[PDB]
Amino acid sequence: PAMTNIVLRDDQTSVATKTLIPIVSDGNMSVWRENAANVPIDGQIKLTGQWERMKDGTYRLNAKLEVPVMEPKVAYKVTASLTLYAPSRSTIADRANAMKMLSAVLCGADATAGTTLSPQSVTGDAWKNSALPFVFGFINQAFPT
């Protein structure tokens, strides 16, 4: 399929919407980037999807989100990266099950079946105020013990 915009929501008290527009693709790497006014290219949120069929037939797929913070010059950036390793014998079902289940972990699965926190929540600060296991864990840099 052709790249489209990808529209995201941050966790601010008044949740802000980020629109990532298609920039470039070469068949195995595709780049989307925000086009916010008065921000240099190296300060824009950037999403990259890349994939490779490795020599042994395993597929390695990666989605990487980079959020730079400006001092200008870039002061630093936070990067979040999902890699899926799918050996040659793997099936559609294997990959769907694994992606769904890990996504559920990231969105706050816990000891009760079905628990989730929407990554499109309109509720400000809902992620930074969450006690859910891996939501709190990544944000506070410490997993359950």
Add this chain to the structure above:
Amino acid sequence: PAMTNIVLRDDQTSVATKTLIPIVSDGNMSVWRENAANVPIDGQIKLTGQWERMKDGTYRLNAKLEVPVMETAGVAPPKVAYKVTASLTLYAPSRSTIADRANAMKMLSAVLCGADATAGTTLSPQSVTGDAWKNSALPFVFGFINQAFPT
């Protein structure tokens, strides 16, 4: 807080539940694992959370889900045939804040759950709808499952 069970849903036509039980933590690394019948220890679904302070002060945080598939016998548990591994790594420099990390984790999670050209789009990773993930056209849902992203 202490580890608890982590209960997940697969994408089967009748969605099935997986209960990952806390195994062990050493502060550096915490492990949960399913206890399905007739499956060897290395063949169980396994979730690992770990963190490392890099030499420049950046924290590298990782959550890894391993989903093994067993060989088919022609009951004692068969050998493991292969594993599909999905892993999320967060790189958080020393200057980064709680708000930085919350924003990035929320937004990448939204990508994985099917964000698209319309504000608010999401497919629940706890969906009770059978096959919803493998049937989806949403950009990074279809992309990971079919092993290629939009171009």
